[PDB]
UniProtKB/TrEMBL annotation, chain D:
UniProt organism field: Chaetoceros neogracilis
Function in brief: One of the components of the core complex of photosystem II (PSII), required for its stability and/or assembly. PSII is a light-driven water:plastoquinone oxidoreductase that uses light energy to abstract electrons from H(2)O, generating O(2) and a proton gradient subsequently used for ATP formation. It consists of a core antenna complex that captures photons, and an electron transfer chain that converts photonic excitation into a charge separation.
UniProt keyword terms in alphabetical order: Chloroplast, Membrane, Photosynthesis, Photosystem II, Plastid, Thylakoid, Transmembrane, Transmembrane helix
Location of this chain's protein in the cell: Membrane; Plastid, Chloroplast thylakoid membrane
Full protein name: Photosystem II reaction center protein H
BP terms from Gene Ontology: photosynthesis; protein stabilization
Principal localisation: membrane
Family: Belongs to the PsbH family.
Alphabetical list of PANTHER family matching this protein: PHOTOSYSTEM II REACTION CENTER PROTEIN H (PTHR34469)
From TrEMBL, chain F:
Family: Belongs to the PsbX family. Type 1 subfamily.
Protein name (database record): Photosystem II reaction center protein X
Ranges that cross the membrane: 6-29
Subunit structure: PSII is composed of 1 copy each of membrane proteins PsbA, PsbB, PsbC, PsbD, PsbE, PsbF, PsbH, PsbI, PsbJ, PsbK, PsbL, PsbM, PsbT, PsbX, PsbY, PsbZ, Psb30/Ycf12, at least 3 peripheral proteins of the oxygen-evolving complex and a large number of cofactors. It forms dimeric complexes.
Membrane topology: Single-pass membrane protein
Stored Pfam families: PsbX
Subcellular location as annotated: Plastid, Chloroplast thylakoid membrane
GO cellular component terms, A-Z: chloroplast thylakoid membrane; photosystem II
Domain of life: Eukaryota
Organism: Chaetoceros neogracilis
Plastid as UniProt keyword: yes
Keywords: Chloroplast, Membrane, Photosynthesis, Photosystem II, Plastid, Thylakoid, Transmembrane, Transmembrane helix
GO biological process: photosynthesis
Length: 30, 75, 38, 66, 34, 37, 172, 484, 28, 341, 42, 42
């Protein structure tokens, strides 16, 4: 019951790493 | 005046050829004449322990700490 | 009421600074959880 | 720009804005106070630290009257 | 006038006579555990 | 009036002359080394 | 150990058995990351200090940089004259290339040297050992700070792997 | 176009909404102190104010109500233990409910002062742009704080028109709210003198009255108006923060070292009362005078109150708790019930052995029995093989005196080792660890927590002095600098 | 003049190095 | 014109070392903190305070020399030279450990005077004051360790002595007695120090590897005049590099160099908050769910309970020689040894 | 045995500040779609 | 004795859907301030 929170924090951290790499705001010249 | 023009000049090394050995030897004589052990109260190798006091000396009072170090440094 | 305030501004947060602030909260949640659960 | 009855009373307190005393003014009077307040903080710290001993002043838990 | 590289040479070997003097007294005198 | 209180005011006077001899020397030299307009 | 508390089990047992803090290669990389975090926050402040006005006070400071622009985004002469007065004149890199090289030299050389501290202490060539080094003329041992550091190492040495040992010397 | 860290700077050029915001921080601070004190009265238990005071039950804001003169409650209990028929309005529930009602009215006033932002009071009559005369606003607001300082020290504290300060004796036995007459001499700067607190707020209130009389009339110089940037409002904020962490090191200092404004009957003992043996020497002193007046030993220890021995306990030291463990100190080992007594250890030779006490650093400490001259006579050995000072060899017997174990003697090694371990923790108590599910590790007193927050706050506000201060001086260059 | 700026740092430094070379030859 | 203007114009004159108003606080106090350290590590012993040797007169090298903290009997006295402890004597002042407070106090007013130096030069040059705000990081580590840590403890004795190995025992004293590595404020501080060293090694190696050809020589250091307006490295290339290697990358030089300020400094502020919490002994010592379980189940072992047994060795073995004032006389049979060590 | 108020500390320490930072991004993109005037402004 | 998973049920049953409905209002007012073109659109 206690370790369920730790797992959700870890895979939840790896979600926002996934979205930051692939759905990044692509910078554009002009 | 630029710094590198100073130390390459001869007049610089005229002055500091006297002052450096007269000041380095005074730092030698400050030690070899046993003067530094008395200004700063550092123990000589003879006087870490004494004949009476065979333990490690410590200060054990707030306000008579000057008087207690008058005790532990006589013998 | 009185008139409209000329000090109205707008708040911005680009997509870059979203992922900083999300990752800031989750990593502080990973770090400080173990101590709070004790 | 809305006159209220409480706004009319306090209005001379805000009516001045940015009037200054020309020159150096009362600045040397202030520094003598600031030099004095610096000495005051040094003294009451050293009383508390027992590094300034005053006769019949002992920094210890004293019998407050019960 | 003195060439600058002569100045850095004489002072530079003077430091080596100071440093190697300090590593000498790690093996002799006080603090040597002899 | 104690030993500790008399020595502290003497240090306060000594703390005044340390600021003093720095300040008195600084005013005099600031007269001579003024900048041309 | 691949973990967080396992890291500090690794660092403390490595202290008792090898004396890493007295070893000059951990000393040369503490200087690498204290120096590295210095010159990071020292370079990152002098660029951010000397930024050129391109925004208003309402929007962000960062929006005065358009991506891929060819104009320089900070007065480098300004940050050179600041650090040229903050310490003295001749200690300042006017060259931005030699400046941005020194940021790459100092940590990386500090961690090459450090990682060859663990390597030379993997083969039991430990750090310095100044225990019982200061003696009086009688010959009694006078303690130093290394002797106090030794008694911290003796506490971890007699307690690490408290069941694995059978013989008086931790050869492993 | 504001970033998220500049959203509250729309209030810079708006004095009318500068108040509505500053009223909303006030409605949240006051609503906290009301709803915190309502939470504490649901948790407080006035069953035994001797062995379960308010500082064991984790009461934080409750020693601040009882410090300035609130002892009764609407339930009828009191912290002094004397019963009351009617506390009137100002009890614990009356204060908690009145900081809530004050919060609801500062809330509604901030809705007014936000909507009606455009008042003629805040306009400049010479330019029309919204301005605040910061030198004279300081004269008014300092003159008011001279009155509330002088009014507090002369009327609330001295008991002219007020209850007074919680005072106590030197050893935390007796304590009551009483008027305190001021001590004007050099004895006023003794911080454990409660008369210095009365003399301070009376004297320094007058200096704050007649500084507002100065700072109303006399305008600033031309130099100081430009040098300190007194047209800008952030030079008020830059220097107000400097006057706020400076105040927070002081209060965290005098909470941690102890003062007359922090009684050990309300916040708990300091750590310097454990390090110096401030209660060990006092319990012995009340026995050295009892035995000298012709008594048996067990009758001498029976005169010692349970409260005095309760301070001589390492679990009441604030330097024993941890950070991320939570709750009151009663979560530590349970609510104390009784004093088990004072064990005296004697060997088979008959000399008196004192258990070496645990310092505040050591979480674990080996049980060591020492006689009067410092020689190690007995212990409990880690390594039982080559044992030379075990209790089985030395034959240490334990003798209790006072408490509920009043005349008893245990002689065998199984029982003496159990009392030798619990005697290095100060005195010996019987606890009740099943009521609050007490796990078995020490927590901290509200003396320890107050010193934590208000000294980690004051370190953060030092950064705000440098940020908001350097933002005031450098105001023309925060879009950037010019290239020319 | 800068003769007070350097020689406040260099006149001590040579004086202490006169002492640190003397302490290498001191024994028990 | 006036007397204040002549003094203001003299201090701010262009000269070799910029003095300013702040040099009156820096240059006297920094000269005596540094010289008090060089004297105290050379001449003054620790024989009466700690019972050690911490001088060059006593055979210690650069590593084992220190300016040591005073005795526990002194308490938190400021140990003024004229004070009730020293009473004007210089020699008895040094033996009590008076130079240590002399170094720490005149050093604390050097860091005040050096941070004021960075506000004064920035106002004359006319730049934003972020150097003075990034230097507030190191102020928060000096104050909260050399000053605020012994104030919460029993005396000045539990402070770091100003010497190389004397810091090293303070690192070891803080693990056994406080469990400092478990504290999340050190963990956020290591992330800033190793994170700050990371950023300058990348920004050093990415600027130097996207340089433009501005000359025919193989040496690229020669091809930069300082007053040029063309940027010296391709930001578009360096973005395109790290966007494919690491996946995400800076597209903003103003955000990049600010981020090189935020990361090292925050690791000094977050680690400074925790060491204030160890002045009060509010340590993160144990996970009680790990401790209640290891007591009831004498088979459950983690790496975490292995670190407590390493801390019993630090709390027992060094504390005899650590604190000679308290006179810990441990028997041989109470000291926790392992099997056959 | 763990503290049952820590679930409320962590899961509100995650969600409440992280849902805050989402809101500042959604209204940022709405203002950009608000000014742009095409198909999404309304 | 109460169920300790009910605190997580209620306080997330309040906050998570109620913070959702706030977001749909903030982006509604941002689109209206986005089109309006004065002092707040950006
Ligand atoms: C931010 C930027 C800062 C810029 C840097 C500026 C650096 C300036 C240097 C500051 C000088 C501070 C040192 C002053 C000496 C000190 O502190 O000296 C300490 C003395 C207190 O003295 C101690 O007081 C204790 C309390 O004892 C009392 O209690 C005992 C048991 O009750 C006994 O009864 C004893 O008789 C009785 O006196 C013990 O006696 C100690 O032995 C005795 O040394 O206080 C005092 O001088 C003053 C303390 C009150 C002021 C509180 C602010 C300073 C302290 C902040 C830390 C608070 C702790 C929080 C920790 C985190
Ligand atoms: C007396 C207190 C005080 C006051 C009135 C201000 C006022 C201001 N500050 Mg300042 N500041 C202070 C203390 C204060 N500060 C301290 C102590 C620091 C050091 C940490 C700073 C550091 C600082 C920086 C670095 C900046 C400001 C800025 C600002 C301006 C806008 C604030 C803003 O947009 O935040 C908006 C904040 C949010 C939308 C959310 C912040 C969320 C925080 C981090 C966590 C939640 C807060 C928490 C619930 C509070 C608990 C209470 C606790 C304080 C006891 C405003 C003039 C900005 C400025 O200069 O204006 C241009 C700016 O850039 N301040
Ligand atoms: C009849 C005269 C009289 C009397 C008897 C008192 C009595 C007292 N005053 Mg008071 N006072 C008076 C008139 C008087 N006042 C007047 C006329 C003024 C001018 C308005 C003041 C202004 C004043 C101030 C400003 C302070 C006192 C304080 C005190 C208390 C001193 C004992 C104590 O705990 O201080 C303990 C001593 C100190 C805290 C010394 C302060 C020095 C600071 C803390 C140094 C550190 C600063 C730094 C930023 C901290 C971080 C550094 C860190 C590394 C340490 C005591 C209640 C002090 C107080 O309220 O504390 C409870 C206090 O701070 N008085
Ligand atoms: C109507 C007035 C009023 C009254 C009588 C009270 C009464 C009380 N409040 Mg309350 N409060 C009020 C308004 C009031 N409150 C408002 C408006 C707020 C919102 C800001 C609060 C917020 C609040 C909190 C958060 C807390 C209380 C608490 C308390 C209780 C103890 C007070 C205490 O120890 O403070 C001590 C007060 C101080 C130490 C203030 C010191 C002032 C500093 C040092 C001034 C220094 C700067 C000065 C201006 C410089 C110039 C000096 C010049 C003279 C020379 C007490 C029952 C406490 C409690 O138990 O709550 C239930 C508590 O924790 N109050
Ligand atoms: C002039 C400046 C004077 C200082 C500012 C005024 C004092 C403000 C200080 C805060 C108020 C004191 C705390 C509240 C007291 C309280 O509990 O009251 C309660 C007490 C009586 O309270 C009774 O106490 C009993 C014993 O505790 C029982 O509790 C009873 O239940 C309770 O009724 O009444 C007074 O003290 C009221 C006087 C407080 C001052 C009244 C407001 C003064 C406003 C004058 C300023 C306006 C005029 C300026 C000119 C324009
Ligand atoms: C012109 C102006 C010049 C400005 C001078 C500015 C002053 C700053 C100088 C700081 C020097 C601080 C180092 C002290 C070292 C010392 O003297 O050790 C001198 C000690 C004395 O040597 C010891 O002497 C003892 C005598 O009893 C015993 O014999 C010991 O065995 C022997 O080691 O030597 C060492 O410890 C040997 C190693 C020396 C290593 C020093 C370099 C270490 C890295 C520090 C680098 C500092 C950088 C300074 C840059 C300037
Ligand atoms: C938006 C976010 C909203 C969530 C806020 C997140 C904050 C999380 C951290 C606080 C919660 C962690 C507490 C542990 C949880 C727990 O169960 O505790 C539970 C404990 C209460 O403890 C319970 O008490 C009960 C009766 O009171 C019973 O005794 C229970 O047995 C006992 O567990 O709650 C707390 O301790 C809450 C304390 C919060 C206040 C913090 C005080 C310290 C603040 C110091 C500030 C310093 C800051 C300086 C800057 C850095
Ligand atoms: C966004 C909101 C996120 C929150 C969702 C809010 C939903 C709240 C309601 C569900 C939580 C309430 C459960 C009680 C809490 C509690 O502690 O339980 C706790 C129990 C678990 O029970 C625990 O179990 C442990 C080992 O499993 C131990 O045994 C514990 O003792 C035991 O209490 O959890 C549940 O029962 C969760 C059930 C959720 C699934 C619901 C199944 C029924 C759904 C039927 C759907 C019909 C719908 C038709 C449409 C109408
Ligand atoms: C197999 C290899 C493939 C690559 C692997 C991919 C992993 C890459 C990680 C993604 C970083 C995402 C963070 C978003 C961050 C984000 O999106 O920033 C985006 C930001 C882009 O900034 P811009 O210049 O676009 O911003 C200009 C302005 O708009 C500023 O707001 O890029 C960076 O600055 C990131 C550089 C530091 C990168 C920080 C990484 C820290 C490491 C991760 C720490 C978490 C690990 C936790 C694990 C438990
Ligand atoms: C309207 C009205 C009313 C009502 C009112 C009320 C009822 C109130 C309430 C109020 C409330 C009841 C409030 C409260 C508040 C609270 C708060 C505001 C809190 C907060 C806090 C914080 C946020 C903190 C934080 C933290 C944490 C959590 C942890 C640690 C850290 C810190 C400390 C930071 C009346 C009827 C009277 C009148 C009429 C009107
Ligand atoms: C304490 C005191 C005082 C004094 C002060 C002063 C005046 C001091 C100064 C001092 C000083 C200021 C010192 C200095 C020292 C120095 C030294 C002694 C140095 C050394 C060096 C070295 C040894 C190094 C080495 C090297 C080289 C040479 C080269 C290469 C590199 C190296 C680094 C290795 C007084 C009177 C106030 C009184 C009170 C107390
Ligand atoms: O496995 Mn992991 O730690 Ca390297 O030393 Mn030998 O082995 Mn065991 O003991 Mn100690
Ligand atoms: Fe750069």
């Amino acid at each position: 019951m206690e370790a369920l929170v730790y797992t959700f924090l870890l895979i939840g951290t790896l979600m926002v790493i996934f979205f930051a790499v692939f759905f990044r705001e692509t910078p554009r010249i002009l | 005046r630029p710094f590198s023009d100073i130390i390459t000049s001869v007049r610089y090394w005229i002055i500091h050829s006297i002052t450096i050995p007269s000041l380095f030897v005074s730092g030698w004589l400050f030690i070899s004449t046993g003067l530094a052990y008395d200004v700063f109260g550092t123990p000589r190798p003879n006087e870490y322990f004494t004949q009476d006091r065979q333990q490690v000396p410590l200060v054990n009072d707030r306000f008579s700490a000057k008087q207690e170090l008058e005790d532990l440094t006589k013998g | 009421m009185t008139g409209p305030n000329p000090n109205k501004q707008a708040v911005e947060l680009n997509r870059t600074s979203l992922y900083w602030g999300l990752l800031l909260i989750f990593v502080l949640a990973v770090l400080f959880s173990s101590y709070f659960f004790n | 720009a809305l006159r209220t009855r409480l706004g009319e009373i306090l209005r001379p307190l805000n009516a001045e804005y940015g009037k200054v005393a020309p020159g150096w003014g009362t600045t040397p009077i202030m520094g003598i106070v600031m030099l004095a307040f610096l000495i005051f903080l040094v003294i009451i710290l050293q009383i508390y630290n027992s590094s300034l001993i005053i006769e019949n002043v002992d920094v210890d838990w004293a019998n407050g009257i019960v | 006038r003195i060439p600058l590289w002569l100045v850095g040479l004489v002072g530079g070997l003077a430091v080596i006579t100071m440093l190697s003097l300090f590593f000498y007294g790690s093996y002799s005198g006080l603090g040597s555990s002899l | 009036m104690t030993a500790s209180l008399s020595n502290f005011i003497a240090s306060l006077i000594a703390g005044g002359v340390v600021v003093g001899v720095i300040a008195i020397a600084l005013i005099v030299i600031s007269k001579s080394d003024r900048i041309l307009r | 150990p691949l973990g967080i508390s396992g890291t500090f089990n690794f660092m403390l047992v490595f202290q008792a058995e090898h004396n890493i803090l007295m070893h000059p290669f951990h000393m040369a990389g503490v200087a690498g990351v204290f120096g590295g975090s210095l010159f990071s926050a020292m370079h990152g402040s002098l660029v951010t200090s000397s930024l050129i006005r391109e925004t208003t006070e309402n929007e962000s400071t960062n929006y005065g940089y358009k991506f891929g622009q060819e104009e320089e985004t900070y007065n480098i002469v300004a940050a050179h004259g600041y650090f040229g007065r903050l310490i003295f004149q001749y200690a300042s890199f006017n060259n931005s290339r030699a400046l941005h090289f020194f940021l790459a030299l100092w940590p990386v050389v500090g961690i090459w040297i450090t990682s060859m501290g663990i390597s030379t202490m993997a083969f039991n060539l430990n750090g310095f050992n100044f225990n019982q080094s200061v003696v009086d003329s009688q010959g009694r041992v006078i303690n130093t700070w290394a002797d106090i550091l030794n008694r911290a190492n003796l506490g971890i040495e007699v307690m690490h792997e408290r069941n694995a040992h059978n013989f008086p010397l931790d050869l492993a | 176009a504001l970033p998220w860290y500049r959203v509250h700077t729309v209030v810079l050029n708006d004095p009318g909404r500068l108040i509505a915001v500053h009223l909303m921080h006030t409605a949240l601070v006051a609503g906290w102190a009301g709803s915190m004190a309502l939470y504490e009265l649901a948790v407080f238990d006035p069953s035994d104010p001797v062995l379960n005071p308010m500082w064991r039950q984790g009461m934080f804001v409750m020693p601040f109500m009882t410090r300035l003169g609130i002892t009764d409650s609407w339930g009828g209990w009191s912290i002094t233990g004397e019963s009351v028929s009617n506390p009137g309005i100002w009890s614990f529930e009356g204060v908690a409910l009145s900081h809530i009602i004050l919060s609801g009215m500062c809330f509604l006033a901030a809705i007014w002062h936000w909507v009606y932002w455009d008042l003629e009071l805040f306009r400049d009559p010479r330019t029309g742009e919204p301005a605040l005369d910061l030198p004279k606003i300081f004269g008014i607001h300092l003159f008011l704080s001279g009155l509330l300082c002088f009014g507090f020290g002369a009327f609330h504290v001295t008991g002219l028109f007020g209850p007074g300060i919680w005072v106590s004796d030197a050893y935390g036995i007796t304590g009551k709210v009483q008027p305190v007459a001021p001590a004007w001499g050099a004895d006023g700067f003794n911080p454990f003198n409660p008369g210095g607190i009365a003399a301070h707020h009376i004297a320094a209130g007058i200096f704050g009255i007649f500084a507002g009389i100065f700072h109303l009339t006399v305008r600033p110089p031309q130099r100081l108006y430009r040098a300190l940037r007194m047209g800008n409002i952030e030079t008020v904020l830059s220097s107000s923060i400097s006057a706020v962490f400076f105040a927070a090191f002081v209060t965290s200092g005098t909470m941690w070292y102890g003062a007359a404004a922090t009684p050990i009957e309300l916040f708990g003992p300091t750590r310097y009362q454990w390090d110096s043996g401030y209660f060990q020497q006092e319990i012995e002193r009340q026995v050295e005078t009892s035995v000298s007046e012709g008594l048996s030993e067990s009758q001498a220890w029976s005169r010692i109150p349970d409260k005095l021995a309760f301070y001589d306990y390492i679990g009441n030291n604030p330097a024993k708790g941890g950070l991320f463990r939570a709750g009151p100190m009663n979560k530590g080992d349970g609510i104390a019930e009784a004093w088990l007594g004072h064990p005296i250890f004697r060997d088979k030779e008959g000399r008196e052995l004192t258990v070496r006490r645990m310092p505040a650093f050591f979480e674990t400490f080996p049980v060591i029995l020492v006689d009067k001259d410092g020689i190690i006579r007995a212990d409990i050995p880690f390594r039982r093989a080559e044992s030379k000072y075990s209790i089985e060899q030395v034959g240490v017997t334990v003798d209790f005196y006072g408490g509920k174990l009043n005349g008893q003697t245990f002689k065998d090694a199984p029982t003496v080792k159990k009392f030798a371990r619990k005697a290095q923790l100060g005195e010996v108590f019987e606890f009740d660890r099943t009521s609050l599910e007490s796990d078995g590790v020490f927590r901290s007193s509200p003396r320890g927590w107050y010193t934590y927050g208000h000294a980690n706050f004051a370190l953060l506000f030092f950064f705000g002095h440098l940020w908001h201060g350097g933002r005031t001086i450098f105001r023309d260059v925060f879009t950037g600098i010019g290239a020319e | 003049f800068r003769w007070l700026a350097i020689h406040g740092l260099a006149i001590p430094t040579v004086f202490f190095l006169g002492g640190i070379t003397a302490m290498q030859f001191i024994q028990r | 014109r006036g007397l204040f203007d002549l003094v203001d114009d003299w201090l701010k004159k262009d000269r070799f070392v910029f003095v300013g108003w702040s040099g009156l606080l820096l240059f006297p106090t920094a000269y005596l903190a540094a010289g008090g350290w060089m004297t105290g590590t050379t001449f003054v012993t620790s024989w009466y305070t700690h019972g050690l040797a911490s001088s060059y007169l006593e055979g210690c090298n650069f590593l084992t020399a220190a300016v040591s903290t005073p005795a526990n009997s002194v308490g938190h006295s400021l140990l003024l030279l004229w004070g009730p402890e020293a009473q004007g004597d210089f020699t008895r002042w040094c033996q009590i450990g008076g130079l240590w407070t002399f170094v720490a106090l005149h050093g604390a007013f050097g860091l005040i005077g050096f941070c004021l130096r960075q506000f004064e030069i920035a106002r004359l040059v006319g730049i934003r004051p972020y150097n003075a705000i990034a230097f507030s990081g190191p102020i928060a580590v000096f104050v909260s360790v050399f000053l605020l840590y012994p104030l919460g403890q029993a005396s000045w004795f539990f402070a770091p002595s100003f010497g190389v190995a004397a810091i090293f025992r303070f690192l070891l004293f803080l693990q056994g007695f406080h469990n400092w590595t478990l504290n999340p404020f050190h963990m956020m501080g290591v992330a800033g120090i190793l994170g700050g060293a990371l950023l300058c090694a990348i920004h050093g190696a990415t600027v130097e590897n996207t340089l433009f050809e501005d000359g025919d020589a193989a040496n690229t250091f020669r091809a930069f005049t300082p007053t040029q307006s063309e940027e010296t490295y391709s930001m578009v290339t360096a973005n395109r590099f790290w966007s494919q290697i690491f996946g995400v990358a800076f597209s903003n030089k103003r955000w990049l160099h600010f981020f090189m300020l935020f990361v090292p400094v925050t690791g000094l502020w977050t680690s400074s908050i925790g060491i204030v919490g160890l002045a009060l002994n509010l340590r993160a010592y144990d996970f009680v769910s790990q401790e209640l379980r290891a007591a009831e189940d004498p088979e459950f072992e983690t790496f975490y309970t292995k670190n407590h047994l390493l801390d019993e060795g630090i709390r027992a073995w060094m504390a005899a020689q650590d604190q000679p004032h308290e006179n810990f006389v441990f028997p041989e049979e109470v000291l926790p040894r392992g099997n056959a060590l | 045995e763990v503290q049952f108020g820590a679930y409320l500390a962590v899961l509100l320490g995650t969600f409440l500040p992280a849902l805050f930072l989402v809101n500042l991004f959604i209204q940022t993109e709405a203002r950009k779609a608000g000014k742009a005037g095409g198909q999404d402004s309304d």
